[PDB]
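RETRY 2/3 - previous attempt timed out on the joint model. Re-submitting the same 146-residue input unchanged.
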Amino acid sequence: PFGGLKRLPAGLLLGHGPIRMVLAILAFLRFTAIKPSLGLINRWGSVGKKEAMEIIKKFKKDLAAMLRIINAR
Amino acid sequence: PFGGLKRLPAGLLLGHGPIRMVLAILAFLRFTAIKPSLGLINRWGSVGKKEAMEIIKKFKKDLAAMLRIINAR
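RETRY 2/3 succeeded.
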């Protein structure tokens, strides 16, 4: 009925939480052309290049999976 | 400040709202391995293949841009 999340965890949109979820909500804001908060931008600017690259590349493969689901539907 | 979004709009996690934002939050839930609600699943299964392909391909361009920014940092 509600799925795994009733709402975003407190502080996420302000840059607090696990780095993968912070980068995912940053991706969500970019997908929807919404400006992120200052805390979120600070978090984005402070993540190590390596771990962020890994996280975003995995996001890329998640999108690829969604596209395959759409094609196969 | 706190960015253009203090919280997700009402109903979005339950599948209500513009299709781009609904697919963006589905992407977020996939990125973070969180199960979507039945309403979101219904939206996902009901969206036109063409329109969803276009939206998700644009998301792929957004992730490419984020990766570009990380590489530039």
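Chain A has one domain: 1-73. Closing ticket.
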